[PDB]
Ligand binder design. Structure first.
Ligand SMILES: COc1nc(C)cnc1NS(=O)(=O)c1cccnc1-c1ccc(-c2nnco2)cc1
Lengths: 212, 120, 225, 385
């Protein structure tokens, strides 16, 4: 009941930039909205209440506004401390409390191209009984990328896990690791295992393969 | 199946500017993004700029950052590259592509016919 | 000096019982109402339950009704939450928040003070150490360019694991990914180093892993094939 | 014929308009400065208009009658008598300024109420600006010679003496048009549109909140289960919290108690008992009928009063705009389409002068008519008569 929708989902902006987040409500909560800020591994803190009001201690750059059933939170100066997650809330009554999905602000830079590697299984894993191959994507921006595994030129849509790293501080890049695991028999039944990468920077998708 | 070529180029002199656009029809740009490239002689196509859907942002490579600019208009289906401060190494055949996904993934299948912007 | 602390977190089996606590300092429970808020790992926020001691009123969310009970103690100045019949979805981080009463500004102030949080894990399998394997790059893989090696660890059940390279000598140039749920419990992890240098003398590059809860220490060598 | 009757009627209108203006302005001034109930915001500005009217109607019409029935300016035997032909145009162009800027202020302030020191500052600034802007017309007129009755006698007329006066006479007509009949006629209309829109919005919001409360009461009275009472009470709480903001810091206590009873009913409905929720919502009617109806009535009456004052505030400006236009309409024809070879020759050449005389007469009669309407249209003044 009384759902709340947060329109933006990931914003890339640099220092000295203007950012605006929108929030929409289904019913007609009068002025009962609040804006929260959360940094990783910490509890949220309050920024704006009653759709326009500043809590004590918060920076004065933060501002909020209301128009009908649409609420807007604006930041004019993006200091380094202002890179975290932001949440929307309505508090019309105690048992009717809902939160928005969440909007994350991240650093902006130029586009790089993913360097790719592929590592074959070692002797120990196959001696144990399980085989696993890994393909690695390094130092790419923005975040979106696609890794496709092909076994003997046949697509496989199972037994693959993807792990992504948070934005580093040296150059604001990401790393990605995709791992495919199988049985002993399946590792010798087929011959060729390949992984291919598609990203918004590279024109044609890159490929690396190995046969054994 | 989408015919799309950029209008502009021809010639330029140092300290100049141009404006190119492979505005296309038969396919609403409102649901995709427009990406641009540069085919230097003897080199594979290199990324230059990309413009996402409306209100999402535009990204540029380090070679042309701070010099170019990409803006898109959904009603006219027109995407432009206002380029300035051209250099002798800028001489290369520009193309343009439209992605095939709404998750901003990697797919560049529909390639333009090819447009020429030479220098000197 | 308004302050809140929670407790009682830990690891429980499917279909179990657990009890938390919320201590309040610097104010009285007879003037404020208490709420619990959940945060699933890598997800958003969710509301759970509400207690007011003055009116003795309680409210519960839809997904947790019939399995949770909430109470308070004014003499000890504490709030209590009890869960029964837990599932695998219940694993999250729990927060304790305070809210004022209607007449005036305290109602408009909304949630203004929060606890630090308490972690609950619903687990099935017991603890065991990890299996460590190498990942070496072939000579053709290098091809003059930088070649990355790696250490793979699998089948472990702590929450935290630590991986180090050459006892801190190789500080810059490594990435450790977040752990993943693997399959049928347990966790998997990989750590990878780009290591531009190709010198065989320094090619030792041992990976050392620590499993504190199970008291395990493993060291492996990524021989360059 | 034309000229003799024109002179007679001009003398008659001057003689009547003199005493008409003095009576009207003196009456309005006395009421404003004595009636304790009369004094308010717009009344100071209206008294200012009356006094500016009086300071022009006291002396300027008798000398016009003197010129009508003598043909010669008085006090020609002395030397000071020249500056009268400077004071005669000095006052007139001042007075119109007072009537113009004020009719902007009445439009500026009346909207602000819908949306003391300030009035005194505005009045002083308006008077100073109007007086300052009327010095060129004083510096323009100067004595000129001619031969009549065997002596070099004088008629007051504008002569090109100093380049400032030349630059004045090039564009005085168009500057007068662009200032004294252009800016107010647009600013007042813009402010009127703004005021009307704001009033309509406020009425709509108030009516919507009250209707929401009443219909939700009726829905709960006929409810059958928990969901209906839950939704209706949520809507009630939202409407009450939205409506409480209109209260100016009595009524706030009533809104607080209404929200409290709504909260109690919501808690009872949450417990799962519909009948107890209906019993709790029963008491809301008494608080409604004892706290909300009165403030609704007060707000409606106050907004009615604001409309009532705006009525006369803009009837004045419409009368002024009707009165001043024909003179400029007749002048502009003799300046753009002047009787060079265009039409009718002897007819148009004198027709333009005839309507110019009529325009002068009507512009002077505006300096008396305004009190009449204030009493007749406002009605409030009648009560004070
Ligand atoms: C374009 O015209 C005007 N525009 C405006 C804005 C105001 N007044 C205008 N015309 S007006 O002629 O000033 C006038 C208008 C109304 C009543 N009386 C007079 C008048 C009559 C005679 C003399 C005079 N001085 N010496 C000998 O006679 C001076 C003034």
């Amino acid at each position: 009941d009384i759902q709340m929708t947060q329109s933006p989902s990931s914003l890339s902006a640099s220092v000295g930039d203007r950012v605006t987040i929108t929030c929409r409500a289904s019913q007609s909560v009068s002025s009962a909205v609040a804006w929260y800020q959360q940094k990783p591994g910490k509890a949220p803190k309050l920024l704006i209440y009653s759709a326009s009001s500043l809590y004590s201690g918060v920076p004065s750059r933060f501002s909020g506004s209301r128009s009908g059933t649409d609420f807007t939170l604006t930041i004019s100066s993006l200091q380094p401390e202002d890179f975290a997650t932001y949440y929307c809330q309505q508090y019309l009554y105690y048992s009717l409390v809902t939160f928005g999905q969440g909007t994350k602000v991240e650093i902006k830079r130029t586009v790089a191209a993913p360097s790719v590697f592929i590592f074959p299984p070692s002797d120990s894993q196959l001696k144990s009984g399980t085989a696993s191959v890994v393909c690695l994507l390094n130092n790419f921006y923005p975040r979106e990328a696609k890794v496709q595994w092909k076994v003997d030129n046949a697509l496989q849509s199972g037994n693959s896990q993807e792990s992504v790293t948070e934005q580093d501080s040296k150059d604001s890049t990401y790393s990605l690791s995709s791992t495919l695991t199988l049985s002993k028999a399946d590792y010798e039944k087929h011959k060729v295992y390949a992984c291919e990468v598609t990203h918004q920077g590279l024109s044609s998708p890159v490929t690396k393969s190995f046969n054994r | 199946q989408v015919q799309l070529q950029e209008s502009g180029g021809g010639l330029v002199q140092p300290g100049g500017s141009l404006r190119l656009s492979c505005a296309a029809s038969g396919r609403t740009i409102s649901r995709y993004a427009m990406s641009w490239f540069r085919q230097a002689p003897g080199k594979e196509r290199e990324f230059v700029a990309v413009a996402r859907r409306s209100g999402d942002g535009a990204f540029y490579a380090d070679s042309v950052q701070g010099r170019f600019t990409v803006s898109r208009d959904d009603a006219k289906n027109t995407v432009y590259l206002q380029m300035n401060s051209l250099k002798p190494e800028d001489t290369a055949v520009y193309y343009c592509a439209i992605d095939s996904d709404t998750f901003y993934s990697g797919s560049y299948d529909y390639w333009g016919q090819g447009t020429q912007v030479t220098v000197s | 000096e308004v302050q809140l602390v929670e407790s009682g977190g830990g690891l429980v089996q499917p279909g179990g019982s657990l009890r938390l606590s919320c201590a309040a300092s610097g104010f009285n429970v007879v003037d404020f109402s208490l709420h619990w808020v959940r945060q699933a790992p890598g997800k958003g926020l969710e509301w759970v339950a509400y207690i007011s001691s003055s009116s003795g009123s309680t409210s519960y969310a839809d997904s947790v009704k019939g399995r949770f009970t909430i109470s308070a103690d004014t003499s000890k100045n504490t709030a209590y939450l009890q869960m029964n019949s837990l599932r695998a979805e219940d694993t999250a981080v729990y927060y304790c928040a305070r809210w004022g009463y209607w007449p005036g500004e305290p109602w408009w102030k909304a949630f203004d003070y929060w606890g630090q949080g308490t972690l609950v894990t619903v687990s099935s399998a017991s603890t065991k150490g990890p299996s460590v394997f190498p990942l070496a790059p072939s000579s053709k893989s290098t091809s003059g360019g930088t070649a990355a090696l790696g250490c793979l660890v699998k089948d472990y059940f702590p929450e935290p694991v630590t991986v180090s390279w050459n006892s801190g000598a190789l500080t810059s140039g490594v990435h450790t990914f977040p752990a993943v749920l693997q399959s049928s419990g347990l966790y998997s992890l990989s750590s990878v180093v780009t290591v531009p240098s190709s010198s065989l003398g320094t090619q030792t590059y041992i990976c050392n892993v620590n499993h504190k809860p199970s008291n395990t220490k493993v060291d492996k060598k990524v021989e360059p094939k | 014929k034309i000229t003799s009757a024109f002179k007679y009627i001009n003398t008659v209108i001057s003689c009547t308009i003199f005493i008409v203006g003095m009576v009207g302005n003196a009456t309005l001034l006395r009421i404003i400065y004595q009636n304790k109930c009369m004094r308010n915001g717009p009344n100071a500005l209206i008294a200012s208009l009356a006094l500016g009217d009086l300071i022009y109607v006291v002396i300027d019409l008798p000398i016009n009658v003197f010129k009508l029935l003598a043909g010669r300016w008085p006090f020609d035997h002395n030397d000071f008598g020249v500056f009268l032909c400077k004071l005669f145009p000095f006052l007139q162009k001042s007075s119109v300024g007072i009537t113009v800027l004020n009719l902007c202020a009445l439009s500026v302030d009346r909207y602000r109420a819908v949306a003391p020191l300030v009035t005194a500052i505005e009045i002083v600034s308006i008077w100073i600006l109007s007086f300052i802007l009327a010095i060129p017309e004083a510096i323009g007129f100067v004595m000129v010679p001619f031969e009549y009755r065997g002596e070099q006698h004088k008629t007051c007329m504008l002569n090109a003496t100093s380049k400032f006066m030349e630059f004045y006479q090039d564009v005085k007509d168009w500057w007068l048009f662009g200032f004294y009949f252009c800016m107010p006629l647009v600013c007042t209309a813009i402010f009127y549109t703004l005021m009307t829109c704001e009033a309509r919005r406020q009425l709509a919001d108030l009516e919507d909140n009250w209707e929401t409360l009443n219909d939700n009461l009726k829905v709960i009275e006929k409810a059958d289960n928990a969901a209906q009472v839950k939704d209706a009470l949520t809507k009630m709480r939202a409407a009450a919290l939205d409506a409480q903001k209109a209260t100016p810091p009595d009524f706030r206590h009533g809104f607080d108690i209404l929200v409290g009873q709504i909260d109690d009913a919501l808690k009872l409905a949450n417990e799962g008992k519909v009948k107890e929720a209906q019993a709790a919502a029963e008491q809301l009617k008494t608080t409604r009928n004892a706290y909300i109806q009165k403030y609704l009535e007060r707000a409606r009456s106050t907004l009615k009063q604001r409309r009532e004052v705006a009525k006369t505030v803009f009837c004045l400006v419409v009368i002024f705009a009707l009165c001043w236009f024909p003179l400029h309409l007749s002048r502009i024809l003799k300046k753009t389409v002047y009787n060079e070879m265009d039409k009718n020759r002897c007819e148009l050449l004198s027709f333009l002068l005839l309507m110019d005389y009529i325009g002068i007469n009507l512009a002077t009669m505006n300096s008396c008519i305004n009190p009449i309407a204030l009493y007749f249209v406002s009605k409030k003044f009648k009560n004070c008569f």
